Design a protein around this ligand. Structure first.
Ligand SMILES: [K+]
Ligand SMILES: [K+]
Ligand SMILES: [K+]
Ligand SMILES: [K+]
Ligand SMILES: [K+]
Ligand SMILES: [K+]
Ligand SMILES: [K+]
Ligand SMILES: [K+]
Ligand SMILES: [K+]
Ligand SMILES: [K+]
Ligand SMILES: [K+]
Ligand SMILES: [Mg+2]
Ligand SMILES: [Mg+2]
Ligand SMILES: [Mg+2]
Ligand SMILES: [Mg+2]
Ligand SMILES: [Mg+2]
Ligand SMILES: [Mg+2]
Ligand SMILES: [Mg+2]
Ligand SMILES: [Mg+2]
Ligand SMILES: [Mg+2]
Ligand SMILES: [Mg+2]
Ligand SMILES: [Mg+2]
Ligand SMILES: [Mg+2]
Ligand SMILES: [Mg+2]
Ligand SMILES: [Mg+2]
Ligand SMILES: [Mg+2]
Ligand SMILES: [Mg+2]
Ligand SMILES: [Mg+2]
Ligand SMILES: [Mg+2]
Ligand SMILES: [Mg+2]
Ligand SMILES: [Mg+2]
Ligand SMILES: [Mg+2]
Ligand SMILES: [Mg+2]
Ligand SMILES: [Mg+2]
Ligand SMILES: [Mg+2]
Ligand SMILES: [Mg+2]
Ligand SMILES: [Mg+2]
Ligand SMILES: [Mg+2]
Ligand SMILES: [Mg+2]
Ligand SMILES: [Mg+2]
Ligand SMILES: [Zn+2]
Lengths: 174, 207, 38, 141
RNA sequence: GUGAAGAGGGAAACAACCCAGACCGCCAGCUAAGGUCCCAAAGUCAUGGUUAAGUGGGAAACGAUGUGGGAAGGCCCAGACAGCGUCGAGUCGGCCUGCGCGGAAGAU
RNA sequence: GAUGUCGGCUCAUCACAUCCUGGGGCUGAAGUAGGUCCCAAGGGUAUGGCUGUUCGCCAUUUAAAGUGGUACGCGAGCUGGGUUUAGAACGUCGUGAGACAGUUCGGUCCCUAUCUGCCGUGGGCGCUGGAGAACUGAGGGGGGCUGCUCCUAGUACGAGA
RNA sequence: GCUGAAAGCAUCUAAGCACGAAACUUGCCCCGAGAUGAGUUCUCCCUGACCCUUUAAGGGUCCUGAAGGAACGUUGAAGAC
C-alpha cells in the first residue's frame, strides 16, 4: 500500500521490458526476470515505475507492496549488485572456493562441497570468511542460508557458519 | 540385456586360498536375435532371442515363418529383453556368454521346482499345534482363519494350503565365478531356481 | 515448541503470526516462548 | 400410448468438447446429460438416446478452491488394509482421463444402461483424437 | 399427538418426526411437507449481501493482527503511529455484532 | 422353540493415545546420556521360574519386549487347567434335608460344508475369419526389522571423567 | 528457511521460491488384457460349384477339410483330478 505508493526510480543503464506482467530489467552488472501477480499494474514513465491495485482483486494493494519491493531489488542489484558475507567459527573450520563450487571443511568426516547457482558467484578473503555476490536478493539469501545450514551457530560457543552480520545468543551449560 | 541359458547343475570351484565356492553351472549357448522391437512399430525397445535347437517337424508353420524371416535356425523357445538407451542389435546377430565377461553380479530367473499342493506348515511356515496334550485331529491344521461376526468373512490374501512352487522366481546379485566362451559356460556362486535342465534367464544385477 | 490450545504473547518481544492456518507465537528474545496452537 | 424411443432406430451424433479451463463438475453434468440423451425430446428412460462425445485436453480441466491439492480420490483394492488414495493433482499426473471419467460416471445412472451410456464418452488427455472418421461436430460446453 | 389398529409424499435408508387420512378406475389438472447442477421430477432463476473454512456437510472452556457491519473514544499538519533529530497522513485499542479459524485422537 | 462361558494354543486383522527404529522443537540440552512436546503406523516388538490364571512378582535377555478394538478376535480350528451337574471330604452355617461370591480330590467338548468368504486349480463362452507365438502394463499382491564392531577419532566437546 | 508486502518496521506466506522422515508415489520381486475399456507386434493358413425362397449379417446340396488343434500312446525334476 504505502510501499506501492512510493514509485521506484529507474536509473540510466537500467532497461525496462514491460509485456503484460513480466518485468525484464537489463543493467550493466547483469539481467533479471520476474513475472508478476495478476493484481499488479506497472506504469513505466519519466525514468520511473509505478504500482497500484487493479479491480477484481481484493488483495490488490498488498500485491503492489510486494511488487514494488521486488522491483527496487532488481533496480538495485544490476546497478550496484547484492553482496552477502559469512564467517566460519570453530577449531579448524576452513572455507575455500574452486570456480562455482565452494569447498568447506566444517568438522565432518567428509568434505562438504557447495555448488553456487548460475549468476551467484563467490570468493573467500580468508579461510574463516566467505563473500557471496549476485544480482538477485532472493538467490544470494537462499545460497547463504544453504551454507549456514551445513553447520548452524550452536548455543554454547557460537561455532559453525554465522552470517558475519548476525549475533549468536550464547548460554552457559548447566 | 541378459541371455537365456540352461541349468546344467551344481558343483564347486576350489580357489588357491582353500575356499570352496558352490557354483551353479549355466550352459549359455548362442542367443540368436529373432526380432528387434522399436518405438515406431511396437511402442517399446527390445530384442527377441532364441537359443538351442528344435526338431524340424515339431516347429509349426507359424513359428517356422517367424524364424525364417529372421534368417535364424529354430531354437527351443522365444524370450524378450528390454533394451536401454545405449544399446542396439540387429536381427540374426548372435550374442554369446562373453557379454558377461566384465559383469560381476547377475540376477538369475527360473521356474522354481514344483511342490504340488502344499499345506500351511510347508507353504507358509505355520507352527504345528501340540503333537499330544489332548490335540484332536488338529496337528498340522491351520487353526483359526478369522475373527467373529466382525468382520464375518475371511480376508483376501489369507495364508492357506495350495499349489506351491512351479512359479517364476528371481535370485538377485549372484557373483559370477567364471565365464568361458569356449565351453559356453557361465558359473555363478550359489543356488538358482529350477530343476536340472531348466531354462534360466541371466541378466546383470539390477542392484 | 509449546503446543497448546491457548497460545499468547509471553513477553514484549513475542509476536503472533498465522502460518498455514496455524496461530503461532514467535519470539526473538526467548526460545521457550515459541508456541503453536494445537 | 406415449412414444417410446427404439434402440435399433435411435439417431446418435458425434460431438467433440475441449475440457481446457472448464470447471470439472459443471463440464461433467453437461456430459452426463448428453450421454443420457436428456437434451432430446425422444428421451426414454430405458433407452440410450444420448450422443457420442469426445473430450479433449482432460489434463487441463479446472477445479476451484484448494481441490487441486485437497480433493482426494479413494479406492479399495479388495485386500484388507487396501485403502488407497490419490489427490486430484496426482490423478492429473498419472491418469488424467480418469478425473473426467470418474466425475461423469458418478453422475450417470447405475446399472447396465448407465454403463452403456458411459461407453459413448471418449476422453483424451491431449488435443488429438483418432475419430476423424466419425466427423465430430464441435460442442461448446 | 402419532404408532398401535394407518397406506401415500418428505426426512438417503428410518412404527412413533414433518406433510397427509388410501371406496374403485384414468397415460388429466392443482397443491402440502419437502424440493428444482447430474444420479433424480422441477430455477445452472432474478436482485443485494456474507463465507474461502469444502465452513456448509460433528464437538466446549479457552486462544487469535481471519474477514464484513455499527456506535462511540484517543492522538494527529502546535507533524501522530512505525522506522527514527527527521519523514508527511493517518495512526492506536477496546465496545457491540454477522460469517469463518484453532481447540478436534479409534479401531474391516 | 439355546447367541458355548475364563485362560492357553493356532491363525490373525485394524486403530494410534508410538514400545523400538526414522524426522523434529524446547530443555534447568557442554559431550555422552536424559527430560518434555510435536510428526510418523513402513517394518519390528523376549524366553523362562511360580500360579488355571489374564495379571503380577521374580530370573535372564532385547533396539524394543507398546496401548487398545476385533462377540473382553478366534471351541462347526485345537485344548479343557479355572469355572457352574451328578461322587466324596474339611472349615463354617443349620435341629435337619442341605448350604457357601470358602476350600479340597474326581469328573463324556458332536457335526461328511449347501451358500457367503478365503486358498488353490480347471471347464465354458467372449474378445467379430481361423491359427501358433512373443508382448505392452491398466490394475493387484509381496517386500520394507535391526544389533554389534572398526574407521572417521580418543577428533569435536570437556576441568577432568 | 529465502525473498516478501498487507502492517513505512517486522513477519517462512498472503504472490513467489528452497529444504525436510522407515509414512505416501516410484524404484526391487511376482501375478496380470474377462483391462467386456477384452490392447499390441511377428508369423502361418483357407482364393470351388450351385440351388432355394417370407431376400438377408438368410437356408440347404455336392465338392472341399488348410494352418492348426484335439484325441490316442510312451511319459516328466509337472501334477489330487
Ligand atoms: K389415527
Ligand atoms: K464439507
Ligand atoms: K491385537
Ligand atoms: K527431543
Ligand atoms: K509402524
Ligand atoms: K460372546
Ligand atoms: K476357549
Ligand atoms: K459358529
Ligand atoms: K472340528
Ligand atoms: K449365503
Ligand atoms: K486381449
Ligand atoms: Mg513336482
Ligand atoms: Mg510351537
Ligand atoms: Mg474326541
Ligand atoms: Mg492325533
Ligand atoms: Mg457385510
Ligand atoms: Mg509448513
Ligand atoms: Mg436409483
Ligand atoms: Mg397388539
Ligand atoms: Mg405412514
Ligand atoms: Mg423413501
Ligand atoms: Mg404446479
Ligand atoms: Mg431433472
Ligand atoms: Mg444464477
Ligand atoms: Mg464438515
Ligand atoms: Mg468452533
Ligand atoms: Mg431357532
Ligand atoms: Mg500421533
Ligand atoms: Mg502396517
Ligand atoms: Mg498405511
Ligand atoms: Mg515406502
Ligand atoms: Mg510370563
Ligand atoms: Mg473372546
Ligand atoms: Mg486382543
Ligand atoms: Mg471340536
Ligand atoms: Mg467359532
Ligand atoms: Mg476343569
Ligand atoms: Mg454332592
Ligand atoms: Mg520487509
Ligand atoms: Mg531400515
Ligand atoms: Zn517472548
Amino acid at each position: 500500500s504505502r510501499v506501492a505508493k512510493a514509485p521506484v526510480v529507474v536509473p540510466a543503464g537500467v532497461d525496462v521490458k514491460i509485456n503484460g506482467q513480466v518485468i525484464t530489467i537489463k543493467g550493466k552488472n547483469g539481467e533479471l526476470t520476474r513475472t508478476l501477480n495478476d493484481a499488479v499494474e506497472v506504469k513505466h514513465a519519466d525514468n520511473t515505475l509505478t504500482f497500484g491495485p487493479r479491480d477484481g482483486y481484493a488483495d490488490g494493494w498488498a500485491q503492489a507492496g510486494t511488487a514494488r519491493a521486488l522491483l527496487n531489488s532488481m533496480v538495485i542489484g544490476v546497478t550496484e549488485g547484492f553482496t552477502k558475507k559469512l564467517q566460519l567459527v570453530g577449531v579448524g573450520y576452513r572455507a575455500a572456493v574452486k570456480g562455482n563450487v565452494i569447498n568447506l571443511s566444517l568438522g565432518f568426516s567428509h568434505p562438504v562441497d557447495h555448488q553456487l547457482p548460475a549468476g551467484i558467484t563467490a570468493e573467500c578473503p580468508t579461510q574463516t570468511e566467505i563473500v557471496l555476490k549476485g544480482a538477485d536478493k532472493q538467490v544470494i539469501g537462499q545460497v547463504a542460508a544453504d551454507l549456514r545450514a551445513y553447520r548452524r551457530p550452536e548455543p554454547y560457543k557460537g561455532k559453525g557458519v554465522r552470517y558475519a552480520d548476525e549475533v549468536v545468543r550464547t548460554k552457559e551449560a548447566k | 540385456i541378459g541371455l537365456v541359458g540352461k541349468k546344467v547343475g551344481m558343483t564347486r570351484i576350489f580357489t588357491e586360498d582353500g575356499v570352496s565356492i558352490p557354483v551353479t553351472v549355466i550352459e549359455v549357448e548362442a542367443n540368436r536375435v529373432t526380432q528387434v522391437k522399436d518405438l515406431a512399430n511396437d511402442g517399446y525397445r527390445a530384442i527377441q532371442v532364441t537359443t538351442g535347437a528344435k526338431k524340424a517337424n515339431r516347429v509349426t508353420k507359424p513359428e517356422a515363418g517367424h524364424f525364417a524371416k529372421a534368417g535364424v535356425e529354430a531354437g527351443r523357445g522365444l524370450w524378450e529383453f528390454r533394451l536401454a538407451e545405449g544399446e542396439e542389435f540387429t536381427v540374426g546377430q548372435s550374442i554369446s556368454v562373453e557379454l558377461f565377461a566384465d559383469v560381476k553380479k547377475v540376477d538369475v530367473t527360473g521356474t522354481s521346482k514344483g511342490k504340488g499342493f502344499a499345506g500351511t506348515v510347508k507353504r507358509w511356515n505355520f507352527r504345528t499345534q501340540d503333537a499330544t496334550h489332548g490335540n484332536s485331529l488338529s496337528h498340522r491344521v491351520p487353526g483359526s482363519i478369522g475373527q467373529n461376526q466382525t468382520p464375518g468373512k475371511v480376508f483376501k490374501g489369507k495364508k492357506m494350503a495350495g499349489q506351491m512352487g512351479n512359479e517364476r522366481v528371481t535370485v538377485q546379485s549372484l557373483d559370477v565365478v567364471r565365464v568361458d566362451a569356449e565351453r559356453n559356460l557361465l558359473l555363478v556362486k550359489g543356488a538358482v531356481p529350477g530343476a536340472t535342465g531348466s531354462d534360466l534367464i541371466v541378466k546383470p544385477a539390477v542392484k | 515448541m509449546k503446543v497448546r490450545a491457548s497460545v499468547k504473547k509471553l513477553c514484549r518481544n513475542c509476536k503472533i503470526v498465522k502460518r498455514d492456518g496455524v496461530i503461532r507465537v514467535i519470539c526473538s528474545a526467548e526460545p521457550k516462548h515459541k508456541q503453536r496452537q494445537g | 400410448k406415449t412414444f417410446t424411443a427404439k434402440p435399433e432406430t435411435v439417431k446418435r451424433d458425434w460431438y467433440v468438447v475441449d475440457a481446457t479451463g472448464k470447471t470439472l463438475g459443471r463440464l461433467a453434468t453437461e456430459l452426463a446429460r448428453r450421454l443420457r440423451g436428456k437434451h432430446k425430446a425422444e428421451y426414454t428412460p430405458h433407452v440410450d438416446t444420448g450422443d457420442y462425445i469426445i473430450v479433449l485436453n482432460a489434463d487441463k480441466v479446472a477445479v476451484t478452491g484448494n481441490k487441486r491439492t485437497d480433493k482426494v480420490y479413494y479406492h479399495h483394492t479388495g485386500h484388507i488394509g487396501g485403502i488407497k488414495q490419490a489427490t486430484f493433482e496426482e490423478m492429473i499426473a498419472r491418469r488424467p482421463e480418469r478425473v473426467i471419467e470418474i466425475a461423469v460416471k458418478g453422475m450417470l445412472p447405475k446399472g447396465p444402461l448407465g454403463r452403456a451410456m458411459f461407453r459413448k464418452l471418449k476422453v483424451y488427455a491431449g488435443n488429438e483424437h483418432n475419430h476423424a472418421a466419425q466427423q465430430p461436430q464441435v460442442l461448446d460446453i
